[PDB]
Write a protein that binds this ligand. Structure first.
Ligand SMILES: [K+]
Ligand SMILES: [K+]
Ligand SMILES: [K+]
Ligand SMILES: [K+]
Ligand SMILES: [Zn+2]
Ligand SMILES: [Zn+2]
Ligand SMILES: [Zn+2]
Ligand SMILES: [Zn+2]
Lengths: 351, 353, 356, 344
């Protein structure tokens, strides 16, 4: 009831690119191995954290998010030697089961957390999810785990779900899924560089559409490598004020760790202290009840320390000019939708 | 009365996407080169009827393949690229290309058998004869020849002949018809005791249960086989057994990779050899036959060989009369095995000069 | 013998071959050495205008200057299997480990004898090739990185600055990986690239090295196929030789693939023996003709025999306008490498002085 | 009754689909686990053991270090072949380590009385792997590893009964000189032309262990239930009774079954089940049964289930073969005259 659960299963290590290559793919089984070994050594998991049984998600639960076409396509890759949905998104014959285990782990953690069987949880899962849209696998992602968790939670009775995506890349897949949706609030912080950073989506004025306006909040950095001070600042002035006004029943963190110091893809500078602080800050919205789902993150040392710092928080254990400009531009846009941001607006204006 | 040619430019879209050190030999230029050479010869378009190209249906493919196999192939249209085996690729256009290739074969068989046209040539890719009941392999997605055979039977053909002169044994075709006697499968191919791809099709792989003797494998033991050995095997094995079978419908799996200059087959069949082989089979069903493209990887060789074959389908120095020692021994080994199922060969087999 | 050319060769390198029956033969095959050796014998070049050198298997200690212990153990273990695959295109049979070790051994001993002056220069007639093998992995038909081994062996024998020029039509992703952070080794590679749609996909013009290695990997990537002599000569005049002259190496290695040759089925380019001759002679300027030439790729038997004989004649002492695509490649490389080789400003001005 | 199983042994397979697909394939374990599931056990009546990877120290009681190192370096390759017909992929080394670890942990538990008996439902098979060679689809010799692990737990005398349709040339080679292990093999032999062409009738042990390898080489194909039970009551059980073993291992292949495409013999689940009951007389039904070959999916599911039930509760050409064995073996087994007399 007050415990932290970790969702993990070794069959997700079977998803990998087919052979060794001149340029090996950064999304690789060692990511989970390195985190799992560092949680073992710390006594965090196994140990202080509870395991949950790993279940393959059902097609019916996936179709709350994805078309039946996309689910069948992913499943059928199990009969091919290897395949690519896009140039950067691979599958082997074991990838469909891995993806069903990642989504099933997220689904069950989301149910367990929201209905109060456990306090909070970390889905230590592969492949990542937040670039998978309604009908397209891309950006290393096969099914959108975070969006599945949100809809499993809603189905269990959550009216308002918040997703915070601190992966260094914009969650184009998640935003597409909840574009016209206002029972889910999507907040993403990500490198953008005027749209030159992959995937080039998620400009600050991409606020949702057609009745969902205001419920997609993009905080897009104009450069790297952004450090802790800019994330905490954006959390104090954008994330927390909007999240508090929205008042969610359920909180999902899309925790990519590719914004960490040392990541070869993100080239940003967030420390474990930064991830720790952001986790604590989000805890005060739902009294420490939250589902943390692994997305990106590619330096084994960096993601091991950052994931350990985050799970320890689950257990209860002055910005740059670029950062100011991003927050300023976000509040200019979101003020029309979140009037309570005026208070934060006047505090920002005082530098 | 006329000759039909089945063709569609959308089969040109199937190609190997992944960057590989060695370029794949099964490539769109194969069809381009043949189409271009037929156009300048004035044969197609021009003298042949260009039938309408239709995608085959799953239900038609399933009288040969499993439902799982058909869904696997169809799903690759949703992937940038994929592999069924390490040498058998697909890109997002491959499923349509394979449906068109099988669909052209299906409709040519129907039109040829029912008399709408006299004969036809399926200018198609990917090839077909390596795909089995369950699996795509050896560059092949669906088995076009097997599909045309079963479509012909559904239209009333009671006895179908498939003669496969691709340099490789059609393991897929034999696996489909291994236990059938309503289809006679005759394959000539380099074999070298199993050391030539794909390693199947020894002289004694004859069929099973209902089907002993309805798979006839003519396996060469070496690799420079020329026209004289092919004509000799045709005179003494193929035509005698096919005539005893007496088919209602004739299919040629016409690979041209035993042709002089082919880099994979390294044999020495010339356009005169392919021409003469087509004429000989033409005397079985009054010139009515479906010729289906399988392999063949040298652009000049397949162009010259496909034109010669099609000119024979249109009504049009000798090949030597003595076979090589290796060719003669191959024919002896085949007759020794097949005489038990085709007693009519005792006539032939007193070839003992 | 100190003014002689040596040729390293051993018939046990011919036993490495593909055992599995495939529809398509593997282009990396024993006939490659056989054709070159027969052609050198016919031309009176070897034997015996050239000296042989005793073949010796490289040691694990020497290979570990470049490769991990586990990669060396992995390659060696293939000698206990009927056949094996490191990747789908990189095979082994029970003789491969010894063959790879002989190839590196010959390169190591040639590099030692050349740099210390026992012989003037040399040609390593070896297989399997090397420049796709990384610190950790065999791939691209290569088991160990022969050229990287020669470079570190020459460094252990006193060479401070080593130049590797790689004119194989493929980019040497493995050599670049090994020396990515190194500046005591300058790696220059010309290769077809086409924006990454050519194997192995690596080696864009802006991949210049990292950490203190910045500027010490120089990639000349062709945007198209069919590249001929005039583009290679043009890129040597304005990119290769200027940078190599500024670096000023104590030891020169040529990763000599001949798969850019006219007739090669894997490169589909058009370099002639005359182009390989001229590129060898130009590189002779840097070093009084003291260089080690190491066979990498090259798959058409007639083309590799002609080109290898022509190159070895130059070791023995024996069109000026680029394509449009060739000019563009050289311009993009100059624009990148100016940050690290400011003396390319001189070559830039000379280049502009000719049109069009 | 325990059952050793782990789904990571399903990862061992050939690299890609081929014209001639390999008969030793993960489906073999999938068919048995299914037929067991429907009649639950399994799972149900039988205990499940935790799967441990055998260690090198245990494997080296049986195999050379040369062999053990070759097998697990294949996890660093895309795919490999030890011989024409013995493949490995990236996962083969772990699968073979799990199969041996399962057999070893059953052998310790069954002998030390922690359970009456057990079935090791394992892939790849073992009985053709010798001291130095992976061959005949086999990477590590599971039966041999179980016998030596049993002895290390104080079992002084171990019997291995091998009714796979092929001779266990690997097992015999490991134990050719040992008399502490009794190896009895029933196999098709046809004068040395049935794979692997070893295991003639006159091929008893050597030299310290002559008479401790007992080969029953069938004349022909189509061997049926009658011949096998005939040889069990005139050869196996007599020689086994004189031996008096502490631990009994069955190398249970099922490629002598009705419909198998490699054996082409006619044994039925009746024969397998009664063969199992007969050996249960010794040691009171305390056996470790280890899956070897058997390639027709429904036959091996039938026969394996027949066998596991028993552990819970529940002629002319074959004639000469038996007397051929008795002529040879009675010199090393005097008690055989009692069974020889019955012929008659
Ligand atoms: K994000
Ligand atoms: K054929
Ligand atoms: K190069
Ligand atoms: K046996
Ligand atoms: Zn990311
Ligand atoms: Zn072919
Ligand atoms: Zn090359
Ligand atoms: Zn067996």
């Amino acid at each position: 009831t007050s415990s932290t659960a970790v969702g993990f299963d070794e069959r997700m290590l079977l998803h990998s690119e087919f052979e060794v290559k001149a340029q090996p793919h950064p999304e690789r089984p060692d990511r989970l191995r390195a985190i799992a070994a560092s949680l073992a050594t710390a006594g965090v998991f196994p140990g202080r954290c509870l395991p949950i049984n790993a279940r393959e998600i059902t097609k019916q639960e996936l179709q709350m998010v994805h078309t039946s076409e996309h689910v069948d396509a992913v499943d059928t890759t199990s009969q091919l030697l290897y395949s690519y949905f896009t140039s950067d998104t691979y599958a082997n014959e074991y990838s469909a089961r891995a993806a069903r285990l990642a989504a099933g782990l997220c689904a069950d953690l989301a149910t367990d957390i929201f209905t109060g069987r456990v306090k909070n949880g970390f889905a230590l899962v592969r492949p990542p999810g937040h670039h998978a849209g309604v009908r397209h696998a891309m950006g290393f992602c096969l099914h959108n785990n975070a969006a599945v968790a949100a809809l499993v939670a809603q189905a269990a009775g959550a009216k308002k779900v918040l997703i915070v995506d601190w992966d260094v890349h914009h969650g184009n897949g998640t935003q597409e899924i909840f574009e016209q949706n206002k029972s889910v609030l999507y907040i993403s912080l990500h490198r953008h560089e005027g749209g030159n950073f992959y995937p080039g989506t998620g400009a600050a004025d991409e606020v949702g559409s057609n009745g969902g306006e205001g419920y997609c909040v993009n905080v897009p950095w104009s450069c790297g490598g952004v450090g802790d001070k800019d994330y905490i600042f954006a959390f104090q002035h954008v994330v927390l004020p909007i999240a508090s006004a929205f008042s969610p029943d359920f909180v999902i963190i899309s925790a990519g760790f590719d914004a960490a110091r040392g990541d070869p893809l993100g080239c940003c500078d967030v420390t474990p202290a930064g991830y720790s602080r952001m986790t604590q800050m989000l805890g005060d919205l739902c009294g420490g009840k939250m589902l943390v789902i692994l997305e990106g993150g590619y330096n084994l040392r960096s993601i091991s320390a950052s994931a350990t710092a985050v799970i320890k928080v689950l257990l209860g254990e002055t910005p740059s000019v670029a950062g100011l400009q991003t927050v300023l531009d976000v509040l200019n846009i979101q003020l029309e939708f979140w009037p309570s941001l005026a208070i934060s607006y006047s505090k920002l204006l005082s530098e």
